[PDB]
Amino acid sequence: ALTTISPHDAQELIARGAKLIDIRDADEYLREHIPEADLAPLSVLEQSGLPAKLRHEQIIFHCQAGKRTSNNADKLAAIAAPAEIFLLEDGIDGWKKAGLPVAVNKSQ
Structure with a gap:
C-alpha cells in the first residue's frame, strides 16, 4: 500500500491499467481533470468507499494540487485495500511536474 x-x-x-480516484471535489472537474481518474469526492468515500469499477489490484489517490492527500492516507488505503494504493505526488502537482496537460475542455 501507500507508496x-x-x-x-x-x-x-x-x-497500462492502474486507476486513480479524485477525492477532491466536482467543481474542479469543471475546469480540469487528471491522468485517468473517476469523480469520487469525499462525499462518496465516507458513505461507501471505493467504486466497484476502479477496484483493480492497483489504484492511486489524489486531491487538488496540494490538499495533503497523505493527511488521510490511512483511511484512503483501507477504503481501497487489499489492492495496492499509491499517491501521485501533490495531486495535480505531479501530472503538471512532467508538463502533461489535463483532460480540459478545449476552447480558443
Missing part, C-alpha cells in the same frame, strides 16, 4: 509515487512513472502505469 507516494513520483510523476512521469504514474503516466506509465496508468497507460
